[PDB]
Amino acid sequence: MCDKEFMWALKNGDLDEVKDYVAKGEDVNRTLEGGRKPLHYAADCGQLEILEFLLLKGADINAPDKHHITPLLSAVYEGHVSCVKLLLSKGADKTVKGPDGLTALEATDNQAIKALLQ
Numbered sequence: 364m365c366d367k368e369f370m371w372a373l374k375n376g377d378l379d380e381v382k383d384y385v386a387k388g389e390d391v392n393r394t395l396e397g398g399r400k401p402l403h404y405a406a407d408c409g410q411l412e413i414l415e416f417l418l419l420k421g422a423d424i425n426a427p428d429k430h431h432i433t434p435l436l437s438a439v440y441e442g443h444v445s446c447v448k449l450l451l452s453k454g455a456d457k458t459v460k461g462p463d464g465l466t467a468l469e470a471t472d473n474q475a476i477k478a479l480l481q
Contacts, residue, residue, distance in 0.1 A: 381416065402414060402437075411438075414434065414438075414446045
């Protein structure tokens, strides 16, 4: 009944706001938009701090089924890749849901993304 605050937080780094909601009892898997999880906005723009958060609890780091993709690639085409680093540190593999060797290979040419293909 208020996705705005809940959602507008993942992106505006209001990590303190998304932290209060899950403070209830593990609920890191609610499509706030219509077909996306709170890990795309956090990865796409979570000051790299928000992604590790809602991931610490559950782990939509792989959940994806209809999105046929995992959030590590979300940061890949973002230039942040500060998350991908501490990301696979948990696993998240890299091609566990992408097309194929795309992951970091066909994703770009900067040595930061290629860091995940390491």
